[PDB]
Each structure stands twice: as C-alpha cells, then as structure tokens.
Amino acid sequence: LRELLVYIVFLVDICLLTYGMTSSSAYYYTKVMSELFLHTPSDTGVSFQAISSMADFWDFAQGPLLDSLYWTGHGSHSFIYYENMLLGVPRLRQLKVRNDSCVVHEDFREDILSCYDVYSPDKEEQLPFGPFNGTAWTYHSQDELGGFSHWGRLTSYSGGGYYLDLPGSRQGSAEALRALQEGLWLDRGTRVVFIDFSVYNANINLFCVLRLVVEFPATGGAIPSWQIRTVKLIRFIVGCEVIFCVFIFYYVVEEILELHIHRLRYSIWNILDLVVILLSIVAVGFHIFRTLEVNRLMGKLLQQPNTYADFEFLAFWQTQYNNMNAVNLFFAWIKIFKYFAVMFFIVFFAYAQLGYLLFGTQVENFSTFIKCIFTQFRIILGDFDYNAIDNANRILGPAYFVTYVFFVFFVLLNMFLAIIN
Amino acid sequence: LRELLVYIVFLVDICLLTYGMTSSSAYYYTKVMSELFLHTPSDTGVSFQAISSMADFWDFAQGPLLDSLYWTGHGSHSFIYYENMLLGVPRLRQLKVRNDSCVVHEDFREDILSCYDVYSPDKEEQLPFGPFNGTAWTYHSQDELGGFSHWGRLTSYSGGGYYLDLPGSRQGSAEALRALQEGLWLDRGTRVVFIDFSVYNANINLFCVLRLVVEFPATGGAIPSWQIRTVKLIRFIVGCEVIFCVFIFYYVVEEILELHIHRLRYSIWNILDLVVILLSIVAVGFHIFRTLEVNRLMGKLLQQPNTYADFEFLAFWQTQYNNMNAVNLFFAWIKIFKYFAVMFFIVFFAYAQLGYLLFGTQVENFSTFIKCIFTQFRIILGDFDYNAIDNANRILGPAYFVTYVFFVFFVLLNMFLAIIN
C-alpha cells in the first residue's frame, strides 16, 4: 500500500542498518576474552570471579593478569592470544573516602578512632597521600580524565583519581606493581579499584573493551564485578545509512502534519510513533561522534604509543546505542499492527517487605527491595532456592513460603471464575 | 479520614521505625563474615560446611580459625579484615552425655560395654573429668553462664558447661588448643561443641555475631551448622520512637472502648487488631533491655579486656525482635483493607508417611516427618530430585512418584469442574 509498504521498506532498511554491525562472531570473542582474565587461576589459585580478600587482589594482578597480558605472530604490540592486539595500556583508577566521614557513636571510642564510610558522590579524598608525585598517589578530578560515572554493584561512582597508566613490558609492569605494594596504594578505606584496557582484532573488525571492578565495601571484603563489551567500532560500509537518514525527515513531517491541524483529542499509537522517531535522531547523532572519537583515539596512539586511549566512554555509549537500536527495532516490529490487582500489589510488596526484613542478610538473593520483587516473582515461575530460605531461620522461612505460594495460587484462581463468562 | 488516615500515619511511623535500623549494608557484611570462616580451606583442605570427622575439627580450629582471627590499621584489638574489631574473646562450650545413659540389649555384651545416647535435657554429665581445674574440664550450670537453649539441627540444647574462654594472641591460642588436644577434651560421647564470638565495625554501626556449631550425633560423624546474625546494636537516632510509643496507648483505648460496651457476639479483624497490638509492647520493651545490656557489656570489657562479653542472648532476641517487627509490619500492611480437602489431607500425610518409611535413610531430604510435607509440597511446585528417589530402591521409588503426581493432578483437576459455575 502507499502507507503500509513504505513502513516495510522502512523496516527492512532499519533492520539491515542494525544488523549492519552485528558481528555474528562476537560472543565467542567474549568467551575467550572473559574466560582468559576472569576464570584463570593464579599460582596460589585465585580467580577474578572468586576474589574476596585484599592481599590476593595483588596475586590476581601479578600472576593471572601480568603473566596473562605480555606475550613474546609476535612483534612488540602484545597480541594476547596471537590473534588480537593490545591497543594502548591499561590503567588503575582508585576511589577513596576520608577519615572523618561520619562519627562513631560514643559507646565506642579510644580504639576505633578512624571511621570510613559507604560511598557517596560526597566524602571522597581530594588529597595526595603517598611519598612523592607519581600520578598514582595524587587525586585527579572528574574532568581531568573524562571518565563517566561507572555503575557498580552497590551504588554509582564518579571519575575518580589516583590512576596509574601501566607500562608496556613484562618486567616493567612487575617492577611497577611490586614497588606499588610497599607504598600501600590499596589502603584501608578504598571503595573501588578499577582496571581498564581493551583489545582489537583485524580478523572480524571488532573492538572489545574490558572493565574489571574490585570494590571494597564499607563492611570489608571484596565483591568483584566485570564488564566486557564487544562491538564494531568501525562502520562499502557506509552507503546503506544515507537511505536511513531520509526516513527521519520522511516520518516527522507525516507526524506533524497530523499534529498541526490536530483535533482537541490526541491514543497510544501517537507515542508509539514518538518513541521510535525520537530514538532515531539519537542513533544518527552517534555516528559523527564515533567518526571523530575513534579517529582522535588512534591519532593519540600512533605517536606516543605508551598511553591509555579511552575507549570506555564511546564503548558504553555504543553499547547503549545498539541497545537502543534493538529497542526501537522492536518498537518498529510491534508497530506493524497499524493496518483488579489492588488487593494484590499492596500485599505483593508486603510479602516483599517481609522477605527483605526476615531475609536481610544470609541470602544474596532477597537482599535489596527490588530483588525482593524479582525473587518473589521468580517464585511464581518456579526458580527458587528453598535450601536457603529454610537455612535462614527454620521457623518463619517455610511459614512465609507455604502461605505465599498458597496466596499466589488463590489470587491466580480467583480472577478467572467470574471472567470466564 | 479521621479513622483511616490516622492508621496511615501509624503505618509510616511504624514503617520508618522498623527501617530505622535496617542497614542496607548488612548482607555483604554477612557475605564477608560467613565466607571468611565457613568456606576457608585449611592446610589439609577442610572447610566448616564440609567437616564430618573429629580429627579434622582440630585442623579447622587450628588453621582456618586460628590463622584467620589474629592479624598483625592494626593495634592490639585484632581487626579481622583491617576494618572490623574483635570485641571480647571467643569461647567453646561443650555438652556431653554419660556412660550409663541407656543399657545395651543382652545379645551384645562383653565388648560394647559403654553406651552413650542421643541428646535430651536429661542424661548430661555434671561431672569433671580432666586432670585439674582449668574451667575447660569442669561442668558449669545453666545459670552460671546464662546462655539460652540453642536450637541445632537435630534437637534443642541447653546452657552447658566445659567452656574455654580463649586468650587474645596467636601463640596463646595455639598453645591453649595444642595442649588441649592431648587432654582429649573432645572425647567419645560429645554431642555439641560450640564456638562463639562476635565482631563490630565502626563504618556502618553493625554488630554481627557468629555461632558455629559442630555437633557429634549418637550415630557418629559430625553434621555442622552455623548461625550468623548481623544487626544494629545501637539505635538523632532516638527521637523517632517517642511518637511510636504514643500509638500503643492510642489504639488500646480504641480497642477496649469497643470491647467495654461490646455485644454478646465478638470477626477475625478483632484478632487482627490484637496480633499487631500485642507485638508492639513486646517490641518497645526490648529497647530498655538493649540500653541496659549493651552498656553493661561494654562496661564489662574496657576493664578486664580478656573476657567473653555475651552478645548471643540479645543478638538472638534482637533477631527475633526485628523478625517480629517484620511480622507486625506485614499485619499492618494487610490491615489496610479496613475501609473440601478431607479426602486430600489424610492421603497427603499418608504419602508423606510412605515417603518417610521408604525414604528413611539414603536421602537427607524426606528425612523427618515434617520434611516429608515440605518435600512432598515442593513436588507440587516442581523442585524435586528424582535421581535420589530412583537411587534409593529402584522399584517403589518411581511407583510412589508417578502415582503421587497423578494423584496431585487428579485432585487439582476434580475441584474446579463443579466450582466453575
């Protein structure tokens, strides 16, 4: 039709555009790259998904990441598999928090005088502490480095300081970090230690970026997380987009001509048009930023080759970019169709609240309030761990469980008997 | 309204009161604290969740709890992570049972003369047995120590004797326990060995208590259990409670004025009022007991610092306290609404009884009668282990299973056909 088949042409263009850079050879690259640094055992046998102390972080960052980064085809650019190059050098930016962040209660004094705190956008340390200026002991601002607010497991973070751009040799990084041990760069009151680098292979034209987080909470310990993102970086790779750039102006006019002479009563198909139109401009804006930044970053590197080229910013934005391409593509696929629970939610969150207060600690599920909707929703499906509800209190755990399951069955049965006719 | 909005004000006060001490930074403290002592391997590789013998308990209590408690910021109060202090010293109270507890049957004599027994509140040993008075070999009563009845995995316990308050140094505790080996303090007929201590950090104001149970049943072996509880201990932290203290007297009067001139016919909303009123007085009584006992326990410790300050009593009562706050909070959330199976249960417990007698041993599920309701109820949901029903007898296991599942489907189908109209 003159109005429907145009949208199919718009579909197949926006389909072929999203799949334009959809390497079908990416998730095995994520396998090799994830399970080369994460799951590798050390000499004493510590891996990144199973780090919890602090003295073994300095075994992880000297055995399975220093003896797992520097190979010597092979030249001097440190191909990590022999099939993908290390571009730039990693860096280790550390947040800290300060001693008088909050005050201890007066029952405990005289021994417990220094009182660190949970991380907030306030309460950091904008102060140097080490022996002499070496960049790794001096704070640097949020806009001297430009790194966006990382989102870890507990709370968000910022563009913190104390970073150390690594050298590019096996003996060099060991003589850096071993001399960094006795300085105690990881002192008592750290909140996150990052380590960031990235690698690129020729064979399928994919940049993969690797962010490795070792966060030391206020309670103690270490609860690690990783973030491996693998996308195209680059892109006849460009001519399919100039027909896609037409459709934004093609559809905003057909929207506003209905909106210009609109009546005083405007359905959800209008916002269905709007949510897929507004994401398109955000998508097409990112290409210019990529073509500036990727070129700037390799221009920064072919002279002065020992420097951290920051790929994490446009890596995160490229990842949210093709996430947004997936989401507006899905909205386009749903747009092809253009041809009581009040007594349930307030008790649903009540059982969630009961599960959060009973099962506070002792379970790493049920542990914030949101996760007490996701767990308590998975229980409606059938994924549950009763051997850690019954291993928590032994009296109210099963008492919660049996009557919650009977409540779910009662409320799923009650609605249908009067709605069947 | 004048009767409904007051209850919302009562809700938001009782909500903010329960969340007054709801550290959102507690379950990672339970992670670090649990997985620092439980899951730590020894030199020969024994962990607390995987202890079963008796000669390896004395490797667990000399490698991963003696080389995992005494670190040397750092002073002399034994910060276990470098971020949480060891307050007091642990202790090791041991129950025992006596030789003539029950008599062997007459077919077996002449070799099997000593006959220990399952644990009961009777049948203990109120007798010293070691070389000389050192507190670890002499019984102490239930009210010389004051410890409540612990509830282990098999049956309850009492405030038993034989305890050993540990010293506060690395060489000292090793010279204690190594000299305690050749005395054979853990002899043949023990029923529980406890070890209790607790740690507190400044950074978020939480007391976590740790009770570690190694119980040696009448059959032999060891089947360990732990109990880690982590709560506030302390608490402008107090002024939100004086408005909450008003509402008890506010609502008991409005209950009894209906009850004073009551008719001769009193619904379940009355006991709905009663169950949330009666828990409130029990809740507000605990604060005075905390403010006495926490102060007494740190008064006991700043002079004579080498002593066990008993936190387990008010720790258990604080834990049942905020459990009760969760339960009456849930009853308040359910109280916002104030604006045939006879041929199924007797066969349900019959299949439970059949499963208990067929699957007696060989499965650590199905193993008491209650657990044959919880397992045989989980089978209605979908969590089951058919590779240990079929690995038990191979003939009646599947015969039980298939016809029980067909019975559940038949009785879940039969009720709906006549109730649909």
Added chain:
Amino acid sequence: LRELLVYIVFLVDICLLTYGMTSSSAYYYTKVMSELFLHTPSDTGVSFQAISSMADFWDFAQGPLLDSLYWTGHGSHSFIYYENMLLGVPRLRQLKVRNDSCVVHEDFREDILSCYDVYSPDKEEQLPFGPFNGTAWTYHSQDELGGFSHWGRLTSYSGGGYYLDLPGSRQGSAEALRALQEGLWLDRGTRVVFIDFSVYNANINLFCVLRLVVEFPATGGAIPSWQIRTVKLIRFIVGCEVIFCVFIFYYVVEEILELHIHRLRYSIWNILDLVVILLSIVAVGFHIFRTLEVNRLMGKLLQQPNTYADFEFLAFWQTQYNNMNAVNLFFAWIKIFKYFAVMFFIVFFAYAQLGYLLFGTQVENFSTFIKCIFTQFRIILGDFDYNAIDNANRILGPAYFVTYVFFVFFVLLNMFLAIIN
C-alpha cells in the same frame, strides 16, 4: 462405631507397630556411613562414586577402605568412627564369565580370539584358575554361600564364587590384597566384584549393612553402585506385637464370613481388604526368622571371631519388610474411606521409542526403554536436560523436543473442553 472405631484401634496398633522400630536417628548414620567410604578420596584421589577404571579399584581398596576401616574407645574389634563396631569381616565375591561364551563374527579373527560376554545366569566360570587352593581362586556354588541374587544396575546376578573373607588387621589385609594383585584376581572378563560388610552401634541399636558393587560390563570400564541399608535388627520391646497378632485372625474371619455366604457377584474394596490382610501374615512371619537368624549369627561370631556373618540376606528382607509395612500402612490409611488416552499411549511410547533410538548412547538418561518413559514423563513436569538433547545430534533433538512438548500441550488441552460441561 462397632465396625469403624475397631479399625482405628487397628490403625493405631499397626501405626505404633511400624514405628516400633523407626529409629529417628538413622539417616545421619547413613550419612556418616555412606560418606565415610563412598566419598572419601584416595592418595591419588579416587572415590567410590567416581571409579571407572580397573587399576584404580585397587587404589580404592587399599587407601580409602584399608586406611579407612582399621583404627587403633579402642580395643581390638575395629570401631570405625570410635562409636560403632565392625562385626565380622568383609568379603569380596567375584563373578566371572567364560572365554567361549559367544563366537566372534568371521570378519574378525586371528587377533580377537577370546570373546567374553554380557552377564546371564548361564555362561559363568565354575572353574578354578589361580595357583593353589586359597578360596579366592576357586568357584563356590550358589548354595555353599547362600547369598541371594543381587540386583545391580544392568541385570540381576547370582550367588557367585571366588570370595575372600578378609583378615582383621591393618597389616594383614594389605599383605592379603597386595599379594592378591600379582595373582591378577581381577582379570579380563570379570562382571561384578562385590565387597560386603556391616557395622553396628550400641547407642541407638541399629544394624547398618554395606554392599559395595564394582561391576565391569562387557563393553569395559566400571560403573559403580552402592547399597547401604540401616535398620533395627533387634525388636519391653516385644509386648506391643501380641495385640497386633490378634487382628489378623480378627479380620480374616470377618472377611470370610462375608465370603462364605457370598453372592454370585463379588468391588475393589474386597481386594483392598485382601492386599492389607495378606501382607500382615508375611510381616509377622519375619519376626521368627529374625529371632532365629540374628541369634545364630552372633552365635557364629563370639567363637571363631574371624568370619563373615552374613547379614545381607535378612538385611534385604528386613528392608523389604519395613517397605511392606509402609505399603500396607498406606493401604490402611487409604482404607479409612470405608464409611480416553488410546490416542495418547500409543504415541507416548512411540515418542519413547524414537527417543530410545535417537538418544541411545550419548545420554545416560533416555537409555533403556523404561527410562524413556520416566524421562519423557519428567519432561511433562519440567525436569529435563536440553543441553544433552541438543548436544546429541543438533538436528532431530530439538525437532523431537519442540513437537513433543506441543503434543503434550495439545493433548492436555483437548480433553478439558468437552469435559467441562
């Protein structure tokens, strides 16, 4: 009533009789006893649930069963935990099969001349093969030993020969089995090697028996199985039974007086009476056999203490005895109520047959025809392993799976629409 309340008295007597010997302290004894021999690692690290070769069976039977049986309270009767005695000595009976059991096909000769076979009640070796008479190299009949037909994993067995009653000392059993290695007692064509012994504790009066099977199939390898059974052995322990003996004669008369003057038309409540009556005589017959055999077996042992007292026979019959007590108890509990699929089964077994022929090997589920009803029934519930259906052929696996699940949903939906009214 005069007919109903008598049955309740019969219930409570038959309930208290079955629970007369229902040690509530048995499944932890099965835990300690199972996980003391099964899951124990060797020096080179082989456990009984993970044995598959033949040269490591002789590490399992020299490290974690010879250094895990002989401890030196402690006398000379080999308490294995220090809390349960080793009564008698173990023995190792071996079946074999003969060289000309079946003939190879004529394409393969000249190299493959000896042709052993799958086990049958025929085709054994009633022949000695070792150097000299020592009982371990000479066949013994099915009625020289009296052992019942064991049922292993593949097929049944018989009372085979070649057994070796072990000595009762640490050096003695090692000098037995090490001298038994170079004789090659486990030669190429074995089908089962057993090892049987049993242990008894005073503390709760339970005999546990342990049968450990290492079967070498015709294909090769070893696919082990165990059989641990733990029951009373013994039994004021006897006077509750003389009232139970009354009810057999009480109810057979009331059955036959209805059957003597019966009409020419006899419902399933009659066979409901019969199945619970006929099991009662079988139950009460076993007590006399226990009181003879248990007494005979300890009479065999207090003189000549170095001999295998065969507990496995009445152990198996005691286990099927209290299984039958569970089953007729369940029938009594179901008897308190005395106050199209033709187009589904033939395709059900057809999909079972398709799954057996597609998924023949490569999966240890789906592997006989029966197990292709149990697996293909578990798929209706939700326990399935799609990562070994898709890891078998990759083309017909999912093709079987998706349309079988759609068939199950179609046939579970089709029956209800016409049966709702």
Added chain:
Amino acid sequence: LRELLVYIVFLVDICLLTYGMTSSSAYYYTKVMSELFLHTPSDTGVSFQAISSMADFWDFAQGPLLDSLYWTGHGSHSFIYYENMLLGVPRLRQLKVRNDSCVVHEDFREDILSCYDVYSPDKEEQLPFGPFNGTAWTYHSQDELGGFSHWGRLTSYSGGGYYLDLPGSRQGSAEALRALQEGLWLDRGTRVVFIDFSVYNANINLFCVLRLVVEFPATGGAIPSWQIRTVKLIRFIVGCEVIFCVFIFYYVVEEILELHIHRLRYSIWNILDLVVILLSIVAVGFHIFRTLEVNRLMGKLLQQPNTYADFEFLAFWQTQYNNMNAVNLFFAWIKIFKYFAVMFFIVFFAYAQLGYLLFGTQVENFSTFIKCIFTQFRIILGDFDYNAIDNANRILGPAYFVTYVFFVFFVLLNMFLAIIN
C-alpha cells in the same frame, strides 16, 4: 483384517528389523569411551571439554591421549581398556585459511598487516608451508581423502588437508608430535584441527567411532566439540531382512494402484504413506554399501596394518540410517490410526531479535537467532538462567524478562476464553 493386520505384520517386521541391531549394551560403551578421552586430566590438568588455549592442546595430545591410547590380554594391537581393540591408526587433518583473505580497514595498518578470517568453503590454503614433504605440511584435496563435510559448532567444513596418519607405538607417536611442535604445524590462522580414530570390541559386536574437534575461531581461543557414535557395523543375522524387503514392493503397488486411477483431488495420509515408503528404499540401499565398505576396510587393514581405515563416512551414514529407521518407525506407529497466532509469531521473533541484540555476547545461550527461539521457548517451560540475564546489562534484562513473561501469560490466557464454548 485383510488390510489392517497386514500393517501390524509390517509393524512387527519393521520393529524387529530396527531392533535387529539395537545393542542394549551401547550407552555404557559410550560412557567408557567418552569419559576415557574427554574427561581425563593431563599432568598439568587439562581435559578435552575444558580446552580453550592452543599451547595446552599440545598437552592434551601428549598426556591424556598419548598416555591413554597405547597399553602394554595384550598383544600388539593396542587394546585401550584390555577389552576393545584399536583398529587402524588415528589421523589429524587440519584446515587453514590464507593471509590476504580480507583486507583490514585503513585506520589500522603498519602493525596488523596479516588478516585471517572466519571459515568459508572458499579462502582456504591449498599450499604447502613446512620444511619438506611429509604429508602433514602439504595440502590434500577433498577427493584425495574422501572425508565428508564435517559440521562443527560454528559453520560447516570440508575434506581438508595437512593430515598426519599416526604411527602405532608409544615412543613413535611422541617422537612424531614432539618433532611436530617445533615445526609449528598448528600456526596462527588454523580453523579446525581434527583427530579421528575408532575402536571395536568382540564381546557385543559394536564399532564405536570417535571424532574429536578442536576448532580455533577467527576471534581466537578454542571451543571444543566431540562426536562419539557407536553402532553395529555387522548385521543367523541376515534372514529377518528378506521378509522386510518384500513389503516395499508390497506397498508401492497398493499406493500406485490408488494413484493410477486416482481422481482429480488427492489428504495428508497420502504423504504419510509416502514419507514411510521413500525412507525404506534409502534404508535397504545402505546394507549393500555396508557389506562392500566394511569388507573393503578390513581388507585394507590385515595387510599394511599401519593405515587409517576410514570408518567415519559409513559411521555417519549408519548413524543417520538408524536415525531414519527411528523416524520412519515412528511414522509407522503414528500410521496405526488408519482404521490464531499471527499476533503471536511476529512479536515472538521480535522478542527473539531483541534478545539477540541485547544479549549478543555475554551469554552462550541467546547467541544466534535460532538459539533465541530455543531459549525463548524454554522460558515458556521453565528452564532459564536469570543470573545471566540480570548479569548482562542490569537495566533492560529484567525489563525484557518481566514483560515477556507477562506477554506469554496474556497470550496463553486470551485464546481460551472465547474457545471454551
């Protein structure tokens, strides 16, 4: 009947024919054979299901496959268990791809000059590269070897070159492969390395074949797969088939006599006849090919015993043969009965597409488009891994999950309310 009972006779003949060679002793042979080479640890502890690097492939192929193939009843034909012979010798055929396969983009030059590629039927290396002619360094065509197109995990393959027929001794294969290391036969740009051999036992007359794939993708790493197939090879074993050969001509005539004088309107029972008739000729053709090829392969081996007898071709065709026997047997069992979703699929594949683009990498499920129908169909059943949807992005993962599950429940509920009457 004269038309129905003939088909039952045809059933029981075609049943007994398919089960004619249905070794009930095959899946334990697959257990021993799979878990003898796959799951065996090396000296440094690498197994075949857990190989990912390249320098540890040369530990897998020198410890747990060179010290796990050559045993020294025992003669000189290398019985691998002592109960199944090694017939022939293994071989190691390697595919490669060439340097100028695709060109790098112009932003990256001067360092990244060699650019290998994903595997295709084009782009190989038909060129020798090693020092001198030894067969292992020279390409051989697809029809010099005759090996069919293997189907690995990523994409299909072909009959590639570079193979090395192994010798038949322990010292010989080690002196082959250790001298093959310094030549670097596994160089940077390999795509698959195969290793193929097969073993046969006398005891139940089964040939099992073993294909072991170590594929090095374009990204790097190694993602291994295996293929173990175990069938009869041979077959009074032949006389049951001459009655089965009658039924093809018996039923094609009864089909075409209906088809010769057929009306101008031909139901799906006709193609139901056709799909079970046409597979029968394909089945009966394979027997002649087996009787030629099995005889040729053992004729190739009794003289010149050090050669690879290719069993993989007729092994794959025998496996698809008894797969086809299972499928037409199932169609025969279904043939005994001869006596809106348009708004669901386009959003079903839309959610699949959203899951493929969100969950591209980071999950080895959800990873191609097809697997986003199999996973997103398993979610309707209940097998899902929410701890890798929530561990992927943390924002859209649960947002996808909750509304997809609510969509599935809404569309499964909506169809029944109007179809109930």
